[PDB]
Design an enzyme around this catalytic site. Sequence first.
Site, short mmCIF file in Angstrom:
data_model
loop_
_atom_site.label_atom_id
_atom_site.label_comp_id
_atom_site.label_asym_id
_atom_site.label_seq_id
_atom_site.Cartn_x
_atom_site.Cartn_y
_atom_site.Cartn_z
CG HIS A 67 -8.95 -3.86 4.02
ND1 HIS A 67 -10.21 -4.01 4.55
CD2 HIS A 67 -8.65 -2.54 4.16
CE1 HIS A 67 -10.66 -2.85 4.98
NE2 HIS A 67 -9.73 -1.94 4.75
CG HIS A 91 -7.12 -1.09 -0.59
ND1 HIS A 91 -7.93 0.02 -0.68
CD2 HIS A 91 -6.42 -0.96 0.56
CE1 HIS A 91 -7.73 0.80 0.37
NE2 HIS A 91 -6.81 0.23 1.14
CG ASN A 128 -12.04 3.19 -2.64
OD1 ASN A 128 -12.29 2.34 -1.79
ND2 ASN A 128 -10.87 3.26 -3.26
CD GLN A 130 -20.15 3.72 -0.33
OE1 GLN A 130 -19.29 4.50 -0.73
NE2 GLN A 130 -19.89 2.78 0.57
#
Lengths: 325, 325
Positions: B76, B80, B237, B285
């Site tokens: 963060h 980003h 992402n 993921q």
Amino acid sequence: MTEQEDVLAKELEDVNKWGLHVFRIAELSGNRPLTVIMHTIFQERDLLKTFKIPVDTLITYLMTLEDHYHADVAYHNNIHAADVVQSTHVLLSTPALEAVFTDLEILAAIFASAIHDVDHPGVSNQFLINTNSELALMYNDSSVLENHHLAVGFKLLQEENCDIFQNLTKKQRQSLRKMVIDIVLATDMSKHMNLLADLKTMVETKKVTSSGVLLLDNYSDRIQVLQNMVHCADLSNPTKPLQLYRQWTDRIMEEFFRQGDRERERGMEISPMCDKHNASVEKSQVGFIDYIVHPLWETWADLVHPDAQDILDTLEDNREWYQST
Amino acid sequence: MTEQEDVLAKELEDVNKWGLHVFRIAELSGNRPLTVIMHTIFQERDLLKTFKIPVDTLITYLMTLEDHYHADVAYHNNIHAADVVQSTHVLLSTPALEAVFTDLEILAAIFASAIHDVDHPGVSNQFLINTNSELALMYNDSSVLENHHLAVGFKLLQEENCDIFQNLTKKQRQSLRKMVIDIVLATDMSKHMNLLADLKTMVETKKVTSSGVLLLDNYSDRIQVLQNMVHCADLSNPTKPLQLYRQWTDRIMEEFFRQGDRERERGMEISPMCDKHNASVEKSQVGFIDYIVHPLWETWADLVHPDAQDILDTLEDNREWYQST
Ligand SMILES: COc1ccc(Cc2nccc3cc(OC)c(OC)cc23)cc1OC
Ligand SMILES: COc1ccc(Cc2nccc3cc(OC)c(OC)cc23)cc1OC
Ligand SMILES: [Mg+2]
Ligand SMILES: [Mg+2]
Ligand SMILES: [Zn+2]
Ligand SMILES: [Zn+2]
């Protein structure tokens, strides 16, 4: 020393009744109504023992809380605070809600009432937004004051010997905070319409025992009732004896006119009811009852039927008085 | 000096395409990707002239905004930030949304993307709540960071020569703020489920022209699309070329593990995916795509059909890659 001498103690006996002379108590307590009324209610409901709260920590907190209300603010001050506390405390005791709430829930609503207006500058959210104030920046133009009241009320616990919740389990402390936040945020007047709509729905599907006591099994229903309760307490001025109502009306107009003044000197659109050169106090009050207060209390009466009957009659009486003059 | 020499300028030409090497830009710009990508997009969309924004005020703001992102935070951070900006900027240009948004609305979404994570400490709301932090106290345990991002992003405008909105009408400035607040607050991950549900409903009653461009007459529908757009950008992402996705995954795990460490030394329940001794990055993921990202993007693809087709295929490819290893 003696019994007829300490008039404070004598007035503090009317704490359990709707129509307590809060202004008298304010004067006799030395402009400290919130502290004395809180401690009375806390003792009355045994809460000090039930949550192992020491008395000299309770006192120290209430002193500082009361200090952080603004004395120079006409309406949104420590007296109004004590008023709303005391009003909540009474409504917590109507027949139709007996044993309904737990000690922790009760504690939450009272504490919520106690802090719900702390550090109020005496101007509305909209004024704070339109003037690009620190707080409106801080809270992104949504429930600005309500957010700030909670922040202040909670931060003061961290003060030297002020943690009235010190001897609570994390489970309790976390539940309490959740509840106190939910309540105070509901005091925002821009939520009034949703709260009322929600309360109407709850009346239709209400569940009562043979005795006539309300059945609220889930947290979802319970907190909603507390939200409306304190909201009603917040809008209870017109339901009090006329003697008190008219003083509450004087204070709200003085505060409104102070804002409209600042708005005038800044060259802004003057907020409704804030222009002293286009004033109509009496007609304003009749409207306030007809569209805000009466629709709310009629729905509250339905929920606790018929406990709020005296309250509802007094309202319609005071409505008629302001219509007359 | 020359053309093949300033590699920064050359990379900044891929700004309009999905899959821009943001890390390369981060490195070539001197850890200043947010400033250079913002200024490119602002020039690309002519916004400096459309809102009479001086260039040396734009630069001064972006510098300070970029500074207030934390460089030592793994995920963060300013990179980003630039990623999400650039991703929003691309999605603003899909066929099915041509001429749909006004310059002001466009400006709002980009600025929103730019500030949406500023001053992020690298821990979640829940961590800030559970540790009784200053901010969670300040914002009463609701949208804690999201609120703080908005506050910081807006306050920095008041800095010496940083008001990029100085030459806007109050009507515009007030509309912009309303929009920017609505967007950033939607980035809160606890809202994901409602946003998605809302987006699904909008797909069913969508209106398109003969060309195939979306019809959104009211503000209510428009802002909802922008909310989802930046939310998608925030969760993009896994939709990028694998090369980039895997680096984003490395950074999110490093940050998560840093929190779980602090949680361990405090003796707290360790948050999901934050325990480095019970790690399963690859399986995590696959889950993240199957229940969060894919359901979201499939719904976004439906709305802009079939503009997001390449994006959706890339996702299901990357899903398969993490399933394989
Ligand atoms: C939802 O509607 C409102 C609710 C509250 C207010 C302002 C207000 N707040 C607290 C106590 C008040 C008490 C009042 O009378 C004593 C009053 O007079 C109209 C306004 C009050 C204005 C409103 O707009 C008409
Ligand atoms: C609504 O569901 C969530 C949304 C976000 C997160 C945390 C998070 N935020 C931003 C970007 C992220 C990006 C991630 O992968 C690159 C990731 O891995 C699971 C988590 C991320 C956790 C969540 O819980 C499973
Ligand atoms: Mg209030
Ligand atoms: Mg965020
Ligand atoms: Zn009040
Ligand atoms: Zn983000």
